Amino acid sequence: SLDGPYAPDSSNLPSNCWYLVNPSNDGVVFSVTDNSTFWMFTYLVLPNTAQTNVTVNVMNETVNISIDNSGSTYRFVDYIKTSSTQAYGSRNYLNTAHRLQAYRRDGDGNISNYWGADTQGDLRVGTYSNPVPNAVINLNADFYVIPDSQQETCTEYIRGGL
Ligand SMILES: CC(=O)N[C@H]1[C@H](O[C@H]2[C@@H](O)[C@@H](CO)O[C@@H](O[C@H]3[C@H](O)[C@@H](O)[C@H](O)O[C@@H]3CO)[C@@H]2O)O[C@H](CO)[C@@H](O[C@@H]2O[C@H](CO)[C@H](O)[C@H](O)[C@H]2O)[C@@H]1O
């Protein structure tokens, strides 16, 4: 009934379905680039992490990013740049007690994932206006596949675990 788990995989993934990742380790859990206009990855930050600069290998480069999570939950933090020469900067994030985040690429190639300072009242599905329709997506965790028609089921997992 729940479709998965699938081992970590990199692929030009189909659109309009949700890829729900369930990492057991911190660090990069998701990445995508078209090598031209958009570079995105999500870094899982452990609770009670003092601000630190850490080195990350992602999308054939090695970059330094600042991470921080003084709070008591996990933080899935998105890092994005839109030029090769530009530094990655954190954008949206998900503060959550569960190691679950989900991604969708829509018909125009835009990435959606769950954003929120909490997984209750603040939770929302966000979309980045940066189309990468044919890009390889790296899911660096065991993951599940949920049809767009069952998005509320995905939302329930994001809030409450598998
Ligand atoms: C859609 C989105 O990503 N919303 C974010 C929100 O993003 C906005 C922010 O980055 C501003 C920075 O000045 O830029 C906005 O984009 C504009 C372009 O910069 C501009 O050139 C263009 O002409 O118009 C664009 C309109 O979008 C961008 O949308 O940033 C806020 C934080 O400031 C996010 O809210 C925070 O989200 C976290 C979870 O990720 C928590 O929920 C926080 O409580 C909340 O403040 C918002 O999700």
Numbering used by the authors: 64 to 225
Task: Quote from the publication.
Although structurally conserved with a galectin-like fold, sequence-wise VP8* is the least conserved among RV structural proteins contributing to a phylogeny consisting of 37 [P] genotypes9. We have shown that P VP8* exhibits a novel glycan-binding site that adapts to a differential recognition of precursor glycans, which are the core elements of HBGA and human/bovine milk glycans.
The residues interacting with the type II glycan in the P HRV VP8* are conserved in the BRV VP8*, indicating that the bovine VP8* can also bind glycans with the β1,4 motif using the same binding site. The crystals, with four molecules in the asymmetric unit, diffracted to 1.46 Å. The crystal structure shows that the Galβ1,4-GlcNAc moieties of LNnT at the non-reducing end interact at the same binding site as in the human P VP8* with similar hydrophobic interactions involving the conserved N155, Y156, W178, G179 and D185 and hydrogen bond interactions involving the conserved R154 and R187. The electron density for the Glc moiety at the reducing end, however, is not well defined in any of the four molecules in the asymmetric unit because of the lack of engagement by the protein and was not modelled in the final structure. Similar to P HRV VP8*, bovine VP8* also undergoes conformational changes upon binding to LNnT including reorientation of the side chains of R154 and R187. In the ligand-bound bovine P VP8* structure, in all the four molecules of the asymmetric unit, the conformation of the J-K loop remains the same as in the apo structure, despite the space group difference, indicating that the different conformation of the J-K loop from that observed in the human P VP8* is mainly due to the sequence variations and not the ligand binding or crystal contacts.
